[PDB]
A = this chain, B = another copy of it.
Amino acid sequence: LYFQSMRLETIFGLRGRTALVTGSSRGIGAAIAEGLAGAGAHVILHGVKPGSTAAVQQRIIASGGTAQELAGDLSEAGAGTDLIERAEAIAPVDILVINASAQINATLSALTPNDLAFQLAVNLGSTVDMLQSALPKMVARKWGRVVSIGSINQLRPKSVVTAYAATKAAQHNLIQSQARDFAGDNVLLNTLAPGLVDTDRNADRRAQDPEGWDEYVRTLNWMGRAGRPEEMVGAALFLASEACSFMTGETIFLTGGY
């Protein structure tokens, strides 16, 4: 009962809050989802197909947390709106982690109309839709957290991911304009922008080409290595909790130094 101000549970604890984490079936979203549940949030997991989140759900339950799934392809018109509405019908959504994204590599000469539109639909379109449904609901409850997963490419882009990088820049810009609008309602939005992280998106290459991969990562960033998904978790807990009550519209870069 005394000196409560300074405890980890007071600062980062999420008991009584609910988080929706898009693309939490695996990778960074899965790590973040487990971390959030670890701090006490009830977590609504999401993936494209029904049942894709089963393994993460069971890890959350086995660690004494609670979680359930909502599935859906975010490339579909209105999908972001519908996801929020379904999540809200389960419980008030206090925390939204915008993690699922589309990425098709191509330099400008290889960028097709289809690929550009798909990456916009998922990365910008569904983001606009989810914020449009979720933010008024958080504003009405006077508390909200959006943790948008961005990328070092939002700030220093490489043409190998031309379109994706451009959608990540637009996405953070949304986080900024809305943070400015709703800060006074305790509805805060920030971006967590990773550099290179070991996930499925590169699982195959690592396994098939260790020599190359190591020479590449060695001069990519100051640590000379890829990050692990679990290394995103602290920053996500910070951005999802009372701990960031005086921070909004900002980006935390986790790039291994870059």
Interface, chain A (partner B; CB < 8 A): 2-3, 5-9, 11-13, 31, 34-35, 37-39, 59, 62-63, 77, 107-109, 111, 113, 116, 120, 124-125, 128, 131-132, 135-136, 153-154, 156-159, 161-163, 165-174, 176-181, 183-184, 194-195, 197, 221-224, 227-228, 230-235, 237-238, 241-250, 252-258
A159 partner residues in chain B, CB cutoff 8 A: 177-178, 180-181
Most chain B C-beta atoms within 10 Å of own C-beta, residue among A59, A131, A246 = A246
Pair B158/A166 contact, Cβ less than 8 Å: no
A-B residue pairs in contact (CB < 8 Å), sample of 28? A3-B59, A6-B37, A6-B233, A8-B8, A8-B13, A11-B237, A107-B181, A108-B128, A108-B177, A116-B128, A120-B124, A124-B166, A124-B170, A168-B173, A169-B169, A169-B170, A179-B222, A183-B256, A184-B223, A223-B246, A223-B248, A231-B245, A238-B243, A244-B254, A246-B256, A247-B253, A250-B252, A250-B253
A38 partner residues in chain B, CB cutoff 8 A: 3, 6-8
A183 partner residues in chain B, CB cutoff 8 A: 221-223, 256-257
